mmCIF file of N, CA, C and O in Angstrom:
data_model
loop_
_atom_site.group_PDB
_atom_site.id
_atom_site.type_symbol
_atom_site.label_atom_id
_atom_site.label_comp_id
_atom_site.label_asym_id
_atom_site.label_seq_id
_atom_site.Cartn_x
_atom_site.Cartn_y
_atom_site.Cartn_z
ATOM 1 N N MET A 1 -27.291 -30.437 -11.490
ATOM 2 C CA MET A 1 -26.893 -30.865 -10.962
ATOM 3 C C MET A 1 -26.878 -32.186 -12.186
ATOM 4 O O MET A 1 -28.327 -32.464 -12.474
ATOM 5 N N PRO A 2 -26.149 -32.477 -13.608
ATOM 6 C CA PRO A 2 -25.812 -33.223 -14.310
ATOM 7 C C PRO A 2 -25.951 -35.342 -13.851
ATOM 8 O O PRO A 2 -25.211 -35.909 -13.027
ATOM 9 N N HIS A 3 -26.594 -35.945 -15.162
ATOM 10 C CA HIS A 3 -26.772 -37.441 -14.994
ATOM 11 C C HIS A 3 -25.926 -37.828 -15.615
ATOM 12 O O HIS A 3 -25.983 -37.050 -16.782
ATOM 13 N N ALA A 4 -26.195 -39.828 -15.504
ATOM 14 C CA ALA A 4 -25.929 -40.159 -16.005
ATOM 15 C C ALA A 4 -25.967 -39.647 -17.206
ATOM 16 O O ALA A 4 -27.298 -39.479 -17.706
ATOM 17 N N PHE A 5 -25.849 -40.623 -18.716
ATOM 18 C CA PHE A 5 -26.658 -40.590 -19.796
ATOM 19 C C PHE A 5 -28.079 -41.046 -19.811
ATOM 20 O O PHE A 5 -27.728 -42.454 -19.763
ATOM 21 N N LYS A 6 -28.901 -41.565 -20.960
ATOM 22 C CA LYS A 6 -29.848 -42.302 -20.874
ATOM 23 C C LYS A 6 -30.556 -42.234 -22.063
ATOM 24 O O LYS A 6 -30.260 -41.812 -22.819
ATOM 25 N N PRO A 7 -30.959 -43.702 -22.400
ATOM 26 C CA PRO A 7 -32.050 -44.100 -23.310
ATOM 27 C C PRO A 7 -33.009 -42.358 -24.275
ATOM 28 O O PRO A 7 -34.223 -42.533 -22.055
ATOM 29 N N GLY A 8 -33.112 -41.586 -25.079
ATOM 30 C CA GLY A 8 -33.521 -40.909 -24.533
ATOM 31 C C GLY A 8 -33.714 -39.884 -25.245
ATOM 32 O O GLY A 8 -33.209 -38.294 -25.111
ATOM 33 N N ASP A 9 -32.350 -39.606 -24.634
ATOM 34 C CA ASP A 9 -31.313 -37.957 -23.806
ATOM 35 C C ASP A 9 -31.746 -37.470 -25.364
ATOM 36 O O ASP A 9 -31.037 -38.293 -26.053
ATOM 37 N N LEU A 10 -31.673 -36.298 -25.566
ATOM 38 C CA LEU A 10 -31.212 -35.495 -27.607
ATOM 39 C C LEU A 10 -29.960 -34.877 -27.113
ATOM 40 O O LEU A 10 -28.916 -33.914 -26.060
ATOM 41 N N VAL A 11 -28.676 -35.296 -27.930
ATOM 42 C CA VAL A 11 -27.719 -34.247 -27.930
ATOM 43 C C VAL A 11 -27.491 -34.787 -29.626
ATOM 44 O O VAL A 11 -27.860 -34.428 -30.893
ATOM 45 N N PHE A 12 -25.743 -33.376 -29.665
ATOM 46 C CA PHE A 12 -25.132 -33.486 -31.197
ATOM 47 C C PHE A 12 -24.135 -34.582 -30.663
ATOM 48 O O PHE A 12 -23.601 -34.430 -29.289
ATOM 49 N N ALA A 13 -24.154 -35.191 -31.115
ATOM 50 C CA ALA A 13 -22.707 -36.065 -31.284
ATOM 51 C C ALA A 13 -21.864 -36.006 -32.407
ATOM 52 O O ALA A 13 -22.246 -35.638 -33.726
ATOM 53 N N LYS A 14 -20.944 -36.069 -31.856
ATOM 54 C CA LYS A 14 -18.933 -35.729 -33.330
ATOM 55 C C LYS A 14 -18.651 -36.944 -33.766
ATOM 56 O O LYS A 14 -18.373 -37.942 -32.396
ATOM 57 N N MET A 15 -18.608 -37.081 -35.025
ATOM 58 C CA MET A 15 -17.309 -37.846 -35.235
ATOM 59 C C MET A 15 -17.042 -37.448 -36.111
ATOM 60 O O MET A 15 -16.572 -36.129 -36.979
ATOM 61 N N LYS A 16 -15.622 -37.471 -36.220
ATOM 62 C CA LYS A 16 -14.849 -37.465 -37.414
ATOM 63 C C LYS A 16 -14.483 -37.275 -38.261
ATOM 64 O O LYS A 16 -15.471 -38.256 -38.434
ATOM 65 N N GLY A 17 -14.973 -36.281 -39.387
ATOM 66 C CA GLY A 17 -14.999 -35.513 -40.035
ATOM 67 C C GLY A 17 -16.725 -34.978 -40.425
ATOM 68 O O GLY A 17 -17.257 -34.948 -41.404
ATOM 69 N N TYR A 18 -16.969 -35.720 -39.145
ATOM 70 C CA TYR A 18 -17.806 -34.849 -39.749
ATOM 71 C C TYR A 18 -18.546 -33.763 -38.428
ATOM 72 O O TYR A 18 -18.318 -33.675 -37.679
ATOM 73 N N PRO A 19 -19.594 -32.982 -38.444
ATOM 74 C CA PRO A 19 -19.948 -31.098 -38.568
ATOM 75 C C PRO A 19 -20.564 -32.526 -37.016
ATOM 76 O O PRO A 19 -21.296 -33.130 -37.159
ATOM 77 N N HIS A 20 -21.126 -31.529 -35.387
ATOM 78 C CA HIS A 20 -21.828 -32.065 -34.535
ATOM 79 C C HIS A 20 -24.014 -31.602 -35.113
ATOM 80 O O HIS A 20 -23.886 -31.605 -35.949
ATOM 81 N N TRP A 21 -23.947 -33.683 -34.325
ATOM 82 C CA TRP A 21 -25.069 -33.974 -35.624
ATOM 83 C C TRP A 21 -26.072 -35.104 -34.693
ATOM 84 O O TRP A 21 -25.763 -34.596 -33.936
ATOM 85 N N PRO A 22 -26.996 -33.606 -34.676
ATOM 86 C CA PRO A 22 -28.588 -34.066 -34.522
ATOM 87 C C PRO A 22 -28.673 -35.838 -34.034
ATOM 88 O O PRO A 22 -28.743 -36.844 -35.109
ATOM 89 N N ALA A 23 -28.701 -36.261 -32.964
ATOM 90 C CA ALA A 23 -28.876 -38.065 -32.566
ATOM 91 C C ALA A 23 -29.785 -38.239 -31.297
ATOM 92 O O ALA A 23 -30.152 -36.694 -30.467
ATOM 93 N N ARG A 24 -29.458 -39.012 -31.219
ATOM 94 C CA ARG A 24 -30.039 -39.721 -30.088
ATOM 95 C C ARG A 24 -30.035 -40.570 -28.816
ATOM 96 O O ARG A 24 -28.920 -41.640 -30.291
ATOM 97 N N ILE A 25 -29.587 -40.706 -27.868
ATOM 98 C CA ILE A 25 -29.671 -41.512 -27.070
ATOM 99 C C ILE A 25 -30.742 -43.211 -27.411
ATOM 100 O O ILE A 25 -31.018 -43.004 -27.353
ATOM 101 N N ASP A 26 -30.156 -44.399 -28.024
ATOM 102 C CA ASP A 26 -31.672 -45.147 -28.305
ATOM 103 C C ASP A 26 -31.203 -46.547 -27.143
ATOM 104 O O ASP A 26 -30.268 -46.302 -26.086
ATOM 105 N N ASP A 27 -32.393 -46.859 -27.092
ATOM 106 C CA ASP A 27 -32.371 -48.253 -26.204
ATOM 107 C C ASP A 27 -32.170 -48.808 -27.182
ATOM 108 O O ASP A 27 -31.504 -49.111 -28.342
ATOM 109 N N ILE A 28 -31.794 -49.998 -25.908
ATOM 110 C CA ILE A 28 -31.566 -51.351 -27.117
ATOM 111 C C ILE A 28 -32.862 -52.393 -27.301
ATOM 112 O O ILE A 28 -32.835 -52.852 -25.809
ATOM 113 N N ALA A 29 -32.972 -52.587 -28.586
ATOM 114 C CA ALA A 29 -34.386 -53.899 -27.805
ATOM 115 C C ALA A 29 -34.199 -54.529 -27.809
ATOM 116 O O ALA A 29 -32.562 -55.692 -26.827
ATOM 117 N N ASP A 30 -34.402 -55.977 -26.541
ATOM 118 C CA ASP A 30 -33.681 -57.471 -26.694
ATOM 119 C C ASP A 30 -33.795 -58.361 -27.763
ATOM 120 O O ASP A 30 -33.888 -57.970 -28.646
ATOM 121 N N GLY A 31 -32.505 -58.729 -27.062
ATOM 122 C CA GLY A 31 -31.682 -60.049 -28.145
ATOM 123 C C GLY A 31 -31.007 -58.891 -29.813
ATOM 124 O O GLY A 31 -30.005 -59.726 -30.451
ATOM 125 N N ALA A 32 -30.894 -57.451 -28.910
ATOM 126 C CA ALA A 32 -29.938 -56.822 -30.146
ATOM 127 C C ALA A 32 -28.705 -56.310 -29.880
ATOM 128 O O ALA A 32 -28.513 -57.140 -28.285
ATOM 129 N N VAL A 33 -27.842 -56.387 -30.642
ATOM 130 C CA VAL A 33 -26.056 -56.000 -30.474
ATOM 131 C C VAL A 33 -26.481 -55.330 -29.674
ATOM 132 O O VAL A 33 -26.647 -53.844 -30.025
ATOM 133 N N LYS A 34 -25.407 -55.535 -28.494
ATOM 134 C CA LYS A 34 -25.235 -54.907 -27.701
ATOM 135 C C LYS A 34 -24.155 -53.027 -27.298
ATOM 136 O O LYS A 34 -23.414 -54.187 -28.276
ATOM 137 N N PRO A 35 -24.133 -52.034 -27.027
ATOM 138 C CA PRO A 35 -22.529 -51.294 -27.897
ATOM 139 C C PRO A 35 -20.868 -51.985 -26.918
ATOM 140 O O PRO A 35 -21.703 -52.991 -25.467
ATOM 141 N N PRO A 36 -19.632 -51.624 -27.346
ATOM 142 C CA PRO A 36 -18.910 -52.138 -26.046
ATOM 143 C C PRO A 36 -19.780 -50.851 -24.152
ATOM 144 O O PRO A 36 -19.834 -49.996 -24.655
ATOM 145 N N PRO A 37 -17.979 -51.413 -23.564
ATOM 146 C CA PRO A 37 -18.102 -50.806 -22.073
ATOM 147 C C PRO A 37 -18.147 -49.880 -22.555
ATOM 148 O O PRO A 37 -16.976 -48.840 -23.221
ATOM 149 N N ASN A 38 -18.789 -49.137 -21.854
ATOM 150 C CA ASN A 38 -18.634 -47.329 -21.365
ATOM 151 C C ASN A 38 -18.649 -46.629 -23.422
ATOM 152 O O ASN A 38 -19.022 -45.409 -22.590
ATOM 153 N N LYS A 39 -19.437 -47.793 -24.039
ATOM 154 C CA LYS A 39 -20.365 -46.497 -25.082
ATOM 155 C C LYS A 39 -22.117 -46.905 -24.929
ATOM 156 O O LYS A 39 -22.550 -47.276 -24.560
ATOM 157 N N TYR A 40 -22.383 -46.046 -26.052
ATOM 158 C CA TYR A 40 -24.017 -45.599 -25.888
ATOM 159 C C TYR A 40 -23.565 -45.580 -27.238
ATOM 160 O O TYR A 40 -23.710 -45.638 -28.630
ATOM 161 N N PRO A 41 -25.651 -46.533 -27.514
ATOM 162 C CA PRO A 41 -25.943 -46.922 -29.237
ATOM 163 C C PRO A 41 -26.342 -45.124 -29.352
ATOM 164 O O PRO A 41 -27.700 -44.684 -28.962
ATOM 165 N N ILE A 42 -25.695 -44.708 -30.635
ATOM 166 C CA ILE A 42 -25.809 -43.359 -30.675
ATOM 167 C C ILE A 42 -26.985 -43.041 -31.984
ATOM 168 O O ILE A 42 -26.348 -43.891 -33.328
ATOM 169 N N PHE A 43 -28.474 -43.165 -32.409
ATOM 170 C CA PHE A 43 -28.491 -43.151 -33.610
ATOM 171 C C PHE A 43 -28.920 -41.713 -34.616
ATOM 172 O O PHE A 43 -29.350 -40.160 -33.199
ATOM 173 N N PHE A 44 -28.472 -41.294 -35.278
ATOM 174 C CA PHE A 44 -28.396 -40.046 -35.248
ATOM 175 C C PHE A 44 -29.735 -39.917 -36.752
ATOM 176 O O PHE A 44 -29.563 -39.742 -37.699
ATOM 177 N N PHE A 45 -30.490 -38.416 -36.848
ATOM 178 C CA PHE A 45 -31.323 -37.740 -37.343
ATOM 179 C C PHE A 45 -30.722 -37.706 -38.520
ATOM 180 O O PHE A 45 -29.321 -37.568 -39.230
ATOM 181 N N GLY A 46 -32.289 -37.806 -39.541
ATOM 182 C CA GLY A 46 -31.868 -38.143 -40.566
ATOM 183 C C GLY A 46 -30.869 -38.990 -41.621
ATOM 184 O O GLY A 46 -31.548 -39.559 -42.316
ATOM 185 N N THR A 47 -29.805 -39.523 -41.014
ATOM 186 C CA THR A 47 -29.218 -41.092 -41.945
ATOM 187 C C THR A 47 -30.560 -41.875 -41.240
ATOM 188 O O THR A 47 -29.561 -43.077 -41.857
ATOM 189 N N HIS A 48 -30.352 -42.009 -40.571
ATOM 190 C CA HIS A 48 -30.621 -43.030 -39.936
ATOM 191 C C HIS A 48 -29.256 -44.172 -38.849
ATOM 192 O O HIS A 48 -30.501 -45.141 -39.421
ATOM 193 N N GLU A 49 -28.523 -43.873 -38.461
ATOM 194 C CA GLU A 49 -27.946 -44.986 -39.031
ATOM 195 C C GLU A 49 -26.812 -44.660 -37.213
ATOM 196 O O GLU A 49 -27.549 -43.467 -36.732
ATOM 197 N N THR A 50 -26.147 -45.388 -36.460
ATOM 198 C CA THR A 50 -26.092 -46.273 -35.594
ATOM 199 C C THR A 50 -24.427 -46.206 -35.204
ATOM 200 O O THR A 50 -24.287 -46.807 -36.119
ATOM 201 N N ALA A 51 -23.956 -45.676 -33.721
ATOM 202 C CA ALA A 51 -22.635 -45.599 -34.027
ATOM 203 C C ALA A 51 -23.070 -45.396 -32.468
ATOM 204 O O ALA A 51 -23.160 -45.106 -31.757
ATOM 205 N N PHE A 52 -21.698 -46.041 -32.072
ATOM 206 C CA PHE A 52 -21.143 -45.787 -30.743
ATOM 207 C C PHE A 52 -20.783 -45.365 -30.516
ATOM 208 O O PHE A 52 -19.359 -45.192 -30.832
ATOM 209 N N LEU A 53 -21.130 -44.825 -29.596
ATOM 210 C CA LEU A 53 -20.000 -43.950 -28.845
ATOM 211 C C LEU A 53 -19.780 -42.485 -27.011
ATOM 212 O O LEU A 53 -20.840 -44.315 -26.607
ATOM 213 N N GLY A 54 -19.197 -42.772 -27.207
ATOM 214 C CA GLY A 54 -19.000 -42.227 -25.442
ATOM 215 C C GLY A 54 -18.689 -41.063 -24.827
ATOM 216 O O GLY A 54 -18.805 -40.616 -25.983
ATOM 217 N N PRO A 55 -19.867 -40.468 -23.910
ATOM 218 C CA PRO A 55 -19.593 -38.859 -23.299
ATOM 219 C C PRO A 55 -19.178 -38.737 -23.781
ATOM 220 O O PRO A 55 -19.467 -36.922 -24.009
ATOM 221 N N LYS A 56 -17.241 -38.747 -24.110
ATOM 222 C CA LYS A 56 -17.179 -37.559 -24.556
ATOM 223 C C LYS A 56 -17.244 -36.613 -26.309
ATOM 224 O O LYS A 56 -17.202 -35.610 -26.862
ATOM 225 N N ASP A 57 -18.187 -37.522 -27.053
ATOM 226 C CA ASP A 57 -18.258 -37.049 -28.400
ATOM 227 C C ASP A 57 -19.262 -36.508 -28.185
ATOM 228 O O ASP A 57 -20.616 -36.422 -28.814
ATOM 229 N N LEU A 58 -20.912 -37.055 -27.025
ATOM 230 C CA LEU A 58 -21.855 -35.698 -26.926
ATOM 231 C C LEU A 58 -22.057 -35.018 -26.648
ATOM 232 O O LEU A 58 -21.761 -34.625 -24.986
ATOM 233 N N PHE A 59 -22.346 -34.218 -26.537
ATOM 234 C CA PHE A 59 -23.339 -32.721 -26.567
ATOM 235 C C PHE A 59 -24.455 -32.136 -25.977
ATOM 236 O O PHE A 59 -25.471 -33.251 -26.854
ATOM 237 N N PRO A 60 -24.791 -31.559 -24.613
ATOM 238 C CA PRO A 60 -26.836 -31.973 -25.194
ATOM 239 C C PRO A 60 -27.170 -30.521 -25.709
ATOM 240 O O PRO A 60 -27.203 -29.860 -26.880
ATOM 241 N N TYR A 61 -28.702 -31.439 -26.495
ATOM 242 C CA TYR A 61 -28.856 -30.875 -27.437
ATOM 243 C C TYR A 61 -29.951 -29.390 -26.920
ATOM 244 O O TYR A 61 -29.421 -28.230 -27.379
ATOM 245 N N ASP A 62 -30.362 -29.012 -26.248
ATOM 246 C CA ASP A 62 -30.743 -28.243 -25.895
ATOM 247 C C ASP A 62 -29.626 -26.942 -25.204
ATOM 248 O O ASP A 62 -29.601 -26.217 -25.357
ATOM 249 N N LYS A 63 -28.763 -27.070 -24.923
ATOM 250 C CA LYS A 63 -28.291 -26.760 -24.323
ATOM 251 C C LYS A 63 -26.585 -25.539 -25.427
ATOM 252 O O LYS A 63 -26.509 -24.561 -25.649
ATOM 253 N N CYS A 64 -26.237 -27.004 -26.793
ATOM 254 C CA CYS A 64 -26.223 -25.975 -27.961
ATOM 255 C C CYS A 64 -26.386 -26.498 -28.807
ATOM 256 O O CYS A 64 -25.692 -26.216 -29.421
ATOM 257 N N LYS A 65 -27.520 -25.941 -29.125
ATOM 258 C CA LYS A 65 -28.457 -26.362 -29.982
ATOM 259 C C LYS A 65 -28.602 -24.537 -30.912
ATOM 260 O O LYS A 65 -28.359 -24.517 -32.357
ATOM 261 N N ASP A 66 -28.530 -23.086 -30.496
ATOM 262 C CA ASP A 66 -27.725 -22.460 -31.023
ATOM 263 C C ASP A 66 -26.295 -22.793 -31.529
ATOM 264 O O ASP A 66 -26.132 -21.981 -32.519
ATOM 265 N N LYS A 67 -26.071 -22.892 -30.784
ATOM 266 C CA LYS A 67 -24.479 -23.373 -32.041
ATOM 267 C C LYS A 67 -24.312 -24.030 -32.902
ATOM 268 O O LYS A 67 -23.317 -24.058 -34.063
ATOM 269 N N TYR A 68 -24.781 -25.709 -32.804
ATOM 270 C CA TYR A 68 -24.856 -26.895 -33.600
ATOM 271 C C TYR A 68 -26.343 -26.485 -34.678
ATOM 272 O O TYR A 68 -25.902 -28.293 -35.128
ATOM 273 N N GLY A 69 -26.852 -26.081 -34.584
ATOM 274 C CA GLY A 69 -28.229 -26.404 -35.006
ATOM 275 C C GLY A 69 -28.568 -25.232 -36.225
ATOM 276 O O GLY A 69 -30.089 -25.028 -35.808
ATOM 277 N N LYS A 70 -27.508 -25.189 -36.751
ATOM 278 C CA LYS A 70 -27.273 -24.355 -38.143
ATOM 279 C C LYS A 70 -27.844 -25.354 -39.207
ATOM 280 O O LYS A 70 -27.149 -26.700 -39.236
ATOM 281 N N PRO A 71 -28.028 -25.511 -40.442
ATOM 282 C CA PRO A 71 -27.752 -26.061 -41.674
ATOM 283 C C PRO A 71 -27.093 -25.843 -41.786
ATOM 284 O O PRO A 71 -25.787 -25.425 -42.044
ATOM 285 N N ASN A 72 -26.778 -27.411 -42.036
ATOM 286 C CA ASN A 72 -24.814 -28.072 -43.014
ATOM 287 C C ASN A 72 -25.661 -28.634 -43.905
ATOM 288 O O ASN A 72 -26.528 -29.416 -44.985
ATOM 289 N N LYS A 73 -24.897 -28.202 -45.035
ATOM 290 C CA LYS A 73 -24.638 -28.933 -46.725
ATOM 291 C C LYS A 73 -24.678 -30.689 -46.715
ATOM 292 O O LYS A 73 -25.241 -31.157 -48.360
ATOM 293 N N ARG A 74 -24.577 -31.061 -45.098
ATOM 294 C CA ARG A 74 -24.030 -32.290 -46.032
ATOM 295 C C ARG A 74 -25.257 -33.362 -46.162
ATOM 296 O O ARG A 74 -26.050 -32.901 -45.211
ATOM 297 N N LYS A 75 -25.632 -34.836 -46.229
ATOM 298 C CA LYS A 75 -26.104 -35.232 -46.956
ATOM 299 C C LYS A 75 -27.103 -35.981 -45.729
ATOM 300 O O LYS A 75 -26.469 -36.294 -44.329
ATOM 301 N N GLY A 76 -28.368 -35.934 -45.809
ATOM 302 C CA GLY A 76 -29.483 -35.839 -44.150
ATOM 303 C C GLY A 76 -28.723 -35.415 -43.404
ATOM 304 O O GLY A 76 -30.371 -34.859 -42.542
ATOM 305 N N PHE A 77 -28.810 -33.619 -43.024
ATOM 306 C CA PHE A 77 -28.310 -33.149 -41.851
ATOM 307 C C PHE A 77 -29.911 -32.288 -41.431
ATOM 308 O O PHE A 77 -29.869 -32.422 -40.260
ATOM 309 N N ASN A 78 -30.370 -32.061 -42.341
ATOM 310 C CA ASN A 78 -30.876 -30.764 -42.981
ATOM 311 C C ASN A 78 -32.196 -31.386 -42.141
ATOM 312 O O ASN A 78 -33.949 -31.225 -41.473
ATOM 313 N N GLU A 79 -32.732 -32.621 -42.585
ATOM 314 C CA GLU A 79 -34.051 -33.620 -42.628
ATOM 315 C C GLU A 79 -33.704 -34.016 -40.565
ATOM 316 O O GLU A 79 -34.348 -33.849 -39.986
ATOM 317 N N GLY A 80 -32.107 -34.152 -40.739
ATOM 318 C CA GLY A 80 -32.286 -34.504 -38.841
ATOM 319 C C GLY A 80 -32.197 -33.404 -38.432
ATOM 320 O O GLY A 80 -33.265 -34.136 -36.949
ATOM 321 N N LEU A 81 -32.013 -32.430 -38.822
ATOM 322 C CA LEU A 81 -32.365 -31.182 -37.652
ATOM 323 C C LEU A 81 -33.867 -30.914 -37.455
ATOM 324 O O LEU A 81 -34.367 -31.186 -36.082
ATOM 325 N N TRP A 82 -35.120 -31.648 -38.427
ATOM 326 C CA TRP A 82 -36.143 -31.368 -38.491
ATOM 327 C C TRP A 82 -36.723 -32.577 -36.753
ATOM 328 O O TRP A 82 -37.603 -33.170 -36.637
ATOM 329 N N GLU A 83 -36.138 -33.631 -37.589
ATOM 330 C CA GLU A 83 -36.332 -35.094 -36.723
ATOM 331 C C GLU A 83 -36.157 -34.552 -35.063
ATOM 332 O O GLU A 83 -37.081 -34.660 -33.801
ATOM 333 N N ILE A 84 -35.492 -33.522 -34.717
ATOM 334 C CA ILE A 84 -34.552 -33.959 -33.564
ATOM 335 C C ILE A 84 -35.863 -33.288 -33.149
ATOM 336 O O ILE A 84 -35.757 -32.782 -31.646
ATOM 337 N N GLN A 85 -35.662 -31.730 -33.491
ATOM 338 C CA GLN A 85 -37.170 -31.261 -33.169
ATOM 339 C C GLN A 85 -38.092 -30.925 -33.203
ATOM 340 O O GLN A 85 -39.388 -30.705 -31.809
ATOM 341 N N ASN A 86 -38.936 -32.434 -34.259
ATOM 342 C CA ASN A 86 -39.952 -32.462 -34.149
ATOM 343 C C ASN A 86 -40.775 -33.221 -34.263
ATOM 344 O O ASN A 86 -41.275 -33.493 -33.677
ATOM 345 N N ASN A 87 -39.906 -34.791 -34.474
ATOM 346 C CA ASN A 87 -40.648 -35.901 -33.200
ATOM 347 C C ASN A 87 -39.468 -36.815 -33.198
ATOM 348 O O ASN A 87 -38.989 -38.310 -33.410
ATOM 349 N N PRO A 88 -38.682 -36.522 -32.490
ATOM 350 C CA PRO A 88 -37.426 -36.936 -31.847
ATOM 351 C C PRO A 88 -37.263 -38.413 -31.125
ATOM 352 O O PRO A 88 -36.543 -38.834 -31.130
ATOM 353 N N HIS A 89 -38.465 -38.451 -30.672
ATOM 354 C CA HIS A 89 -38.385 -40.571 -30.199
ATOM 355 C C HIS A 89 -39.794 -41.382 -31.382
ATOM 356 O O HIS A 89 -39.537 -42.076 -30.411
ATOM 357 N N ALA A 90 -40.097 -41.124 -31.995
ATOM 358 C CA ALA A 90 -40.466 -41.795 -32.755
ATOM 359 C C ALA A 90 -39.170 -42.974 -33.698
ATOM 360 O O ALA A 90 -38.145 -43.075 -33.263
ATOM 361 N N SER A 91 -40.388 -43.598 -33.768
ATOM 362 C CA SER A 91 -39.472 -44.558 -34.528
ATOM 363 C C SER A 91 -38.895 -44.568 -36.068
ATOM 364 O O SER A 91 -40.612 -44.492 -37.151
ATOM 365 N N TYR A 92 -37.965 -44.834 -36.048
ATOM 366 C CA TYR A 92 -38.091 -44.846 -37.299
ATOM 367 C C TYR A 92 -36.957 -45.390 -38.862
ATOM 368 O O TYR A 92 -37.117 -45.400 -39.108
#
């Protein structure tokens, strides 16, 4: 049975106007800005940007990669596909 999301979990994250995007739950470094309540820091592969999202916009990467893990014309998406598959926990 599923657990709550935790840092390091791999997802597709959905933002308005963007396709479901390869991303990870980030950790929060000591002394760094914390997310709002019930939000997670979402690191988007490829663009390397961070947004604060709730679980309603987070889809498990392994379950959904057949549906969402296809190349996309949007800037950074295909680099992001490489990152989530080949080095998803690296320092970016």
